[PDB]
Enzyme design. Structure first.
Site, PDB file in Angstrom:
ATOM      1  N   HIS A   1      34.322  49.545  43.063  1.00 55.07           N
ATOM      2  CA  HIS A   1      35.017  48.567  42.261  1.00 55.07           C
ATOM      3  C   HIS A   1      34.033  47.948  41.253  1.00 55.07           C
ATOM      4  O   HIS A   1      34.289  47.900  40.035  1.00 55.07           O
ATOM      5  CB  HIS A   1      35.593  47.479  43.226  1.00 55.07           C
ATOM      6  CG  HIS A   1      36.153  46.288  42.479  1.00 55.07           C
ATOM      7  ND1 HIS A   1      37.493  45.948  42.423  1.00 55.07           N
ATOM      8  CD2 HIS A   1      35.441  45.317  41.854  1.00 55.07           C
ATOM      9  CE1 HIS A   1      37.554  44.808  41.722  1.00 55.07           C
ATOM     10  NE2 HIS A   1      36.346  44.387  41.322  1.00 55.07           N
ATOM     11  N   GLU A   2      32.845  47.586  41.710  1.00 54.95           N
ATOM     12  CA  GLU A   2      31.877  46.922  40.831  1.00 54.95           C
ATOM     13  C   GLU A   2      31.275  47.885  39.824  1.00 54.95           C
ATOM     14  O   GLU A   2      31.230  47.560  38.629  1.00 54.95           O
ATOM     15  CB  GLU A   2      30.753  46.297  41.663  1.00 54.95           C
ATOM     16  CG  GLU A   2      31.254  45.144  42.516  1.00 54.95           C
ATOM     17  CD  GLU A   2      31.915  44.069  41.745  1.00 54.95           C
ATOM     18  OE1 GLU A   2      31.668  43.893  40.545  1.00 54.95           O
ATOM     19  OE2 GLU A   2      32.724  43.410  42.430  1.00 54.95           O
TER      20      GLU A   2
ATOM     21  N   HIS B   1      33.549  48.303  36.825  1.00 54.94           N
ATOM     22  CA  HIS B   1      33.451  47.316  35.746  1.00 54.94           C
ATOM     23  C   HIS B   1      32.464  47.834  34.660  1.00 54.94           C
ATOM     24  O   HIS B   1      32.720  47.568  33.488  1.00 54.94           O
ATOM     25  CB  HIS B   1      32.921  45.983  36.280  1.00 54.94           C
ATOM     26  CG  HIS B   1      34.021  45.149  36.926  1.00 54.94           C
ATOM     27  ND1 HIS B   1      35.209  44.859  36.305  1.00 54.94           N
ATOM     28  CD2 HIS B   1      34.069  44.571  38.159  1.00 54.94           C
ATOM     29  CE1 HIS B   1      35.945  44.125  37.138  1.00 54.94           C
ATOM     30  NE2 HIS B   1      35.293  43.927  38.282  1.00 54.94           N
TER      31      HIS B   1
ATOM     32  N   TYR C   1      37.278  39.344  30.146  1.00 54.07           N
ATOM     33  CA  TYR C   1      37.398  38.900  31.530  1.00 54.07           C
ATOM     34  C   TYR C   1      38.181  37.613  31.709  1.00 54.07           C
ATOM     35  O   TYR C   1      37.762  36.676  32.383  1.00 54.07           O
ATOM     36  CB  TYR C   1      36.004  38.874  32.161  1.00 54.07           C
ATOM     37  CG  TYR C   1      36.186  39.252  33.636  1.00 54.07           C
ATOM     38  CD1 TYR C   1      36.691  40.474  34.047  1.00 54.07           C
ATOM     39  CD2 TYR C   1      35.967  38.283  34.602  1.00 54.07           C
ATOM     40  CE1 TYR C   1      36.835  40.789  35.377  1.00 54.07           C
ATOM     41  CE2 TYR C   1      36.200  38.536  35.942  1.00 54.07           C
ATOM     42  CZ  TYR C   1      36.640  39.788  36.312  1.00 54.07           C
ATOM     43  OH  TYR C   1      36.796  40.049  37.634  1.00 54.07           O
TER      44      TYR C   1
ATOM     45  N   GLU D   1      40.231  43.870  36.494  1.00 51.92           N
ATOM     46  CA  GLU D   1      40.184  43.775  37.947  1.00 51.92           C
ATOM     47  C   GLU D   1      40.995  44.893  38.604  1.00 51.92           C
ATOM     48  O   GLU D   1      40.580  45.507  39.577  1.00 51.92           O
ATOM     49  CB  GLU D   1      40.748  42.413  38.354  1.00 51.92           C
ATOM     50  CG  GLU D   1      39.660  41.345  38.471  1.00 51.92           C
ATOM     51  CD  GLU D   1      38.502  41.894  39.271  1.00 51.92           C
ATOM     52  OE1 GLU D   1      38.700  42.238  40.428  1.00 51.92           O
ATOM     53  OE2 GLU D   1      37.403  41.976  38.725  1.00 51.92           O
TER      54      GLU D   1
ATOM     55  N   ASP E   1      40.207  30.760  38.293  1.00 52.05           N
ATOM     56  CA  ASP E   1      39.877  32.192  38.369  1.00 52.05           C
ATOM     57  C   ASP E   1      40.020  32.881  37.025  1.00 52.05           C
ATOM     58  O   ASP E   1      40.600  33.960  36.874  1.00 52.05           O
ATOM     59  CB  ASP E   1      40.754  32.764  39.493  1.00 52.05           C
ATOM     60  CG  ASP E   1      40.523  34.233  39.766  1.00 52.05           C
ATOM     61  OD1 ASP E   1      39.345  34.622  39.760  1.00 52.05           O
ATOM     62  OD2 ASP E   1      41.507  34.981  39.948  1.00 52.05           O
TER      63      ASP E   1
ATOM     64  N   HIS F   1      41.807  37.677  39.438  1.00 50.40           N
ATOM     65  CA  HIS F   1      41.833  38.323  40.747  1.00 50.40           C
ATOM     66  C   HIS F   1      43.210  38.093  41.418  1.00 50.40           C
ATOM     67  O   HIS F   1      43.391  38.629  42.529  1.00 50.40           O
ATOM     68  CB  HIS F   1      40.835  37.691  41.702  1.00 50.40           C
ATOM     69  CG  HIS F   1      39.419  37.908  41.256  1.00 50.40           C
ATOM     70  ND1 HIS F   1      38.627  37.062  40.526  1.00 50.40           N
ATOM     71  CD2 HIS F   1      38.713  39.031  41.566  1.00 50.40           C
ATOM     72  CE1 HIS F   1      37.443  37.678  40.378  1.00 50.40           C
ATOM     73  NE2 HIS F   1      37.482  38.852  41.002  1.00 50.40           N
TER      74      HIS F   1
HETATM   75 ZN   LIG Z   1      36.019  42.960  39.922  1.00 49.12          ZN
END
Ligand SMILES: [Zn+2]
Ligand SMILES: [Ca+2]
Ligand SMILES: [Ca+2]
Ligand SMILES: [Ca+2]
Ligand SMILES: [Ca+2]
Length: 316
Positions: free
Chosen positions: A142-143, A146, A157, A166, A226, A231
């Site tokens: 997932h990271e 990005h 973002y 996300e 957020d 998210h």
């Molecule tokens: Zn993320």
């Protein structure tokens, strides 16, 4: 480091034994020369100064409990690299074999992991909410996704573009977990989240509402926390991706699943050919429809299931 490539052995966060590509030059380093311009794993030594020091080990065996988070960050960065290369023909996150760097043991009791614009950073967790975050293959993927998104669409973002950002990372994080066949599911972060509780996760793609996220556009979060719910509102897109792949009936709308491989291909094309930094959900639908059209034809089941899935979550 300049040295000889070799292969070490160690144990990950969950106690599994794996082999890892290392480099020998007096010490054995966590430097994998076999992928691109290299995969490099550093020790932040419980501080926040990055990247910290390139991980060095004296005998090439990584069985201490302090070594476990580094084993897994190094190994899973390699599996993620392989997925993008083998499935989508993309060489590292920039498409030109950029080196992948990670730091583990960042800070103390840090319950998170993130891409910071140049490298991956992983906390060790506090032992109750999380265990060392590089033990989750979906977290790692997932990271690193990005980084892919930063180099291609450039989704900003916040608000809906940030929620797409996300969801793309949750989609590819999941697809990497399926590709490695590592107990795969549609949930995010279950291998490292709450060690004392069985069966929960941070988020669910098959039923986002299980953990409080919206599964329909009418239920979207419209406040300011957020970063405008990046998210939270990702649940709407996650649910749509799950329906495209697996199929289902959601708020009375029936979707015929087309599988994970076609899902990955359609979202990979949308991400790299049609999304822009400020795309919203509606533009994502158009991008995914056009991508499927490109690949399978305008009267295909695949296009039909993309439209049905966006219909089911209320995105027109
Ligand atoms: Zn993320
Ligand atoms: Ca050792
Ligand atoms: Ca799993
Ligand atoms: Ca998972
Ligand atoms: Ca748990």
């Amino acid at each position: 480091i300049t040295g000889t490539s070799t292969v070490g052995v160690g144990r990950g966060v969950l106690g599994d034994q794996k082999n890892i590509n290392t480099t020998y030059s007096t010490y054995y380093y966590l430097q994998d020369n076999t992928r691109g311009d290299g995969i490099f794993t550093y020790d932040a030594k419980y501080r926040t100064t990055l990247p910290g020091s390139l991980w060095a080990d004296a005998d090439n065996q990584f069985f201490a409990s302090y070594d476990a988070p580094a084993v897994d960050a190094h190994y899973y960065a390699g599996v993620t690299y392989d997925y993008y290369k083998n499935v989508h023909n993309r060489l590292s996150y920039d498409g030109n074999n950029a080196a992948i760097r990670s730091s583990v043991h960042y800070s103390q009791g840090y319950n998170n992991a993130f891409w910071n614009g140049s490298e991956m950073v992983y906390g060790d967790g506090d032992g109750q909410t999380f265990i060392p975050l590089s033990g989750g293959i979906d977290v790692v993927a997932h990271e690193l996704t990005h980084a892919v998104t930063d180099y291609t669409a450039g989704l900003i973002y916040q608000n809906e573009s940030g929620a797409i950002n996300e969801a793309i990372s949750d989609i590819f994080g999941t697809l990497v977990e399926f590709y490695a066949n590592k107990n795969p599911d549609w949930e995010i972060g279950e291998d490292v989240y709450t060690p004392g509780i069985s069966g929960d996760s941070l988020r669910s793609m098959s039923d986002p509402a299980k953990y409080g996220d919206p599964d329909h556009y009418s239920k979207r979060y419209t406040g300011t926390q957020d970063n405008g719910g990046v998210h939270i509102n990702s649940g709407i897109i996650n649910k749509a991706a799950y329906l495209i792949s697996q199929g289902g009936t959601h708020y009375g709308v029936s979707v015929v699943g087309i599988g994970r491989d076609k899902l990955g291909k359609i979202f990979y094309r949308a991400l790299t050919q049609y999304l822009t930094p400020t795309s919203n959900f509606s533009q994502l639908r158009a991008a995914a429809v056009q991508s499927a059209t490109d690949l399978y034809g305008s009267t295909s089941q695949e296009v039909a299931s993309v439209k049905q899935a966006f219909d089911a979550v209320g995105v027109k």
